[PDB]
Symmetry: C2
Subunit: 319 residues, 2 copies
C-alpha cells in the first residue's frame, strides 16, 4: 500500500545524510523504489510532467538504474521527465539519461563545527541571543514523544500565521501543518510569557551529517529579533548535539527567457524562511541546486507544473 | 473596509449581465472602484504581477478610466499589469494602455430561447433526461433560504469529491466550498434515491441575461449520464425561469507562448466538462484573452495567475 511505501521510504531516509528527504513523510508524493528496495525517488505528477523531488534517496549504487527507471516511466506515460532541486552529485546520472541542468538557486549550508558564537566573528549574533532573552524569549527543542503536549498550542500559532499572511498551505517541496506529520519529528519552539510564539519542525537523520527546518511560523506578536533568536538557538542546539551542518534552505541567486522564469521562481518560493542577506549573516557556504530536463523549452513548461504541485497540488494523507 | 467593498461590488454585479462577476463574493480578490463607484475591477497580486480577473464590471462608461487606473496602479507598485480572460470588447481599452492580447480559449454560450429539448435537433439529450430519471435521478434548484437544510450533506459530498480526486480547493477564477459563499447563491442538486449525489452553485444576476455555474461536484457513486442529466435539467429550469443564456464556461481551443497556453487550457478549463461535452448543446463559441505588455510577459504573467488560482490567498 501507499502507507507501507512511505514507512519504508522513511526508514531509508533515517539511515542516510540528506535531511530534506524527510519530506516523504508528508505522504503527498508518489514513491518509486529501486530493484533492491534500498533506494527511492519521490515524485509528483502534474499535467504533462512527472517531477521528482530532489535526488534519489538511499543506496547510491541504485541511483543510475533508478534515474533511468524514472525517465522511462515518465516517457511511457507520455510525460516529460524532470528532477527539481537536484544536487551536483546527481548531474552525471541525469546527463547519462539525456537531461540538461539549469541552476535554480543555492542552499545556505552552515558548518556547525566552525560556528563559534563566543568568537568575535559572530559577536552580533551572540548579542542578539542575549537581547532576545532580556525581552523574555526562551527556546526549547521538543522531542517527538513530547509534541502531543504542545499540539494545541502549535495549531493556534500555525492558524494565526496562515490568517495573518492571508495564505494557504503548500505541498511537494514544502510540508504543511498536518498533525500526524508534525507529530513525527522534533519541534523547535520559541516562548514569551510562558506562551509559544514561534515554531519550526526539525528534519534530521540518524547520521547527524545535516539538519534543516521545514515549516517556520511566528505569531504576529513575536518580538523583533525572534528570527535571529530562533536560528541562532537552533544552530547552537544542533552544534552541541553533534550535527555537522545546518541547511538554511534555498535562496535565489545574487538562457534569457528561461532566466526570467528562474528568477521569478526563486522569489516565489525561496523567501519564506528569511531573505538571502539574512542567511548570509551565518556565513554559510552556498551550494547550487538544479532543475534537470530534456530541453530548454521543457524547462519553463516543467517549472510551471512544479509551480502547481507546490502551490496547490494533491490533498495528500490526512488524519 | 474589504467586507464593505465586497458588498458594494456584489450590488453592482446583480444589476449587470455577466454572471461570472459573482466570483467577487468569495472575497479573495482585491476590488478597485471607479470614481463614480458604479464599476469595479477585481484582481489579484502575485509576485511581480497584478492580474485582473475578467472584464471590469458595471457601468461601461467607467471602463476606460478603470483600465488606465489599474495599469497605472500596477506600474506604481513596480508590477506588470495583466488582464486574465477578458472579452473582445475590452481589447481596445487594453491596447490604449500598450497591452497586446493572446487568445486563451473560448466560452461555450447556449441560447436558452432556442433550446428546444422536445424538438428533433436535441433527441439524444432528451433521451438522456428520461434515462437519468429511470436510473432514479431527481433534480432541484435549492434557493438561498433552504441551503442551510442541505449544507451538512453538501459538505460531505464536497469533502468526498476532494478526497476522491486527491485534490485541493482553488481560488481567483474558481470558487471554493466555503459555507458563507455557498449560502449566498442558489444550488442545483442531483439526488439518486434519497441522497445528494451531485451539486453545483448557480451564478445569476437580476437581469436574467446569463447564468453559469462555479463548483460542479459529483460523488464517485453518481451514475453514468449524471452530467447530461444535470446540465439538461439546469438548462430547462433556466429556460422556464426566463433566462436568455447559460454559460458553460471556458474550454480549451486546440510557438513557446502557444505551448504555454495549450497546457494552461488543459490545466484549468476541463473541470466542468470536456469541449466535446459542451459542444453537444450547440453553443456559440466566444473567445477570451490574456492581455499583457508583450510576448515575454505572457508566460510570466500566466505563471503568476496559475499560483493565484492553484494556491493563492486564504480569503474571507
Amino acid at each position: 500500500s501507499n502507507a507501507e511505501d512511505v514507512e519504508r521510504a522513511t526508514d531509508i531516509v533515517m539511515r542516510q545524510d540528506s535531511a530534506d528527504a524527510n519530506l516523504v513523510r508528508m505522504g503527498d508524493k508518489h514513491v518509486m523504489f529501486s530493484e533492491s528496495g534500498n533506494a527511492f525517488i519521490m515524485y509528483g505528477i502534474q499535467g504533462r510532467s512527472w517531477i521528482a523531488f530532489a535526488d534519489p534517496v538511499g543506496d547510491e549504487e541504485d541511483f543510475p538504474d533508478l534515474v533511468w527507471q524514472f525517465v522511462e516511466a515518465a516517457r511511457g506515460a507520455g510525460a516529460r521527465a524532470a528532477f527539481y532541486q537536484i544536487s551536483p552529485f546527481l548531474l552525471s546520472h541525469c546527463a547519462d539519461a539525456g537531461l540538461r541542468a539549469f541552476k535554480l538557486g543555492e542552499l545556505a549550508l552552515v558548518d556547525l563545527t566552525a560556528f563559534e558564537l563566543k568568537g568575535g566573528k559572530l559577536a552580533t549574533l551572540r548579542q542578539s541571543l542575549s537581547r532576545g532573552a532580556r525581552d523574555g524569549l526562551t527556546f526549547e527543542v521538543v522531542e517527538q514523544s513530547q509534541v502531543p503536549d504542545i499540539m494545541d498550542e502549535l495549531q493556534q500559532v500555525s492558524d494565526g500565521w496562515l490568517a495573518h499572511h492571508n495564505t494557504r498551505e503548500k505541498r511537494f517541496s514544502l510540508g504543511a501543518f498536518e498533525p500526524d506529520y508534525i507529530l513525527s519529528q522534533p519541534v523547535a519552539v520559541l516562548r514569551k510569557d510562558g506562551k509559544i510564539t514561534a515554531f519550526a519542525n526539525l528534519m534530521v537523520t540518524e547520521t547527524k551529517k545535516e539538519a534543516t527546518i521545514d515549516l517556520m511560523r511566528f505569531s504576529a506578536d513575536a518580538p523583533r529579533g525572534s528570527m535571529d533568536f530562533l536560528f541562532v538557538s537552533i544552530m547552537q542546539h544542533l552544534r552541541e548535539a553533534g550535527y555537522e551542518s545546518f541547511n538554511l534552505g534555498m535562496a535565489p541567486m545574487s538562457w534569457d527567457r528561461i532566466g526570467s522564469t528562474l528568477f521569478e521562481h526563486g522569489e516565489r518560493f525561496y523567501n519564506f524562511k528569511g531573505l538571502r542577506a539574512f542567511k548570509a549573516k551565518f556565513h554559510p557556504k552556498w551550494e547550487p541546486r538544479y532543475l534537470a530536463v530534456q530541453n530548454g523549452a521543457d524547462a519553463a513548461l516543467a517549472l510551471m507544473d512544479a509551480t502547481v504541485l507546490i502551490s496547490g497540488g494533491v490533498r495528500g494523507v490526512i488524519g
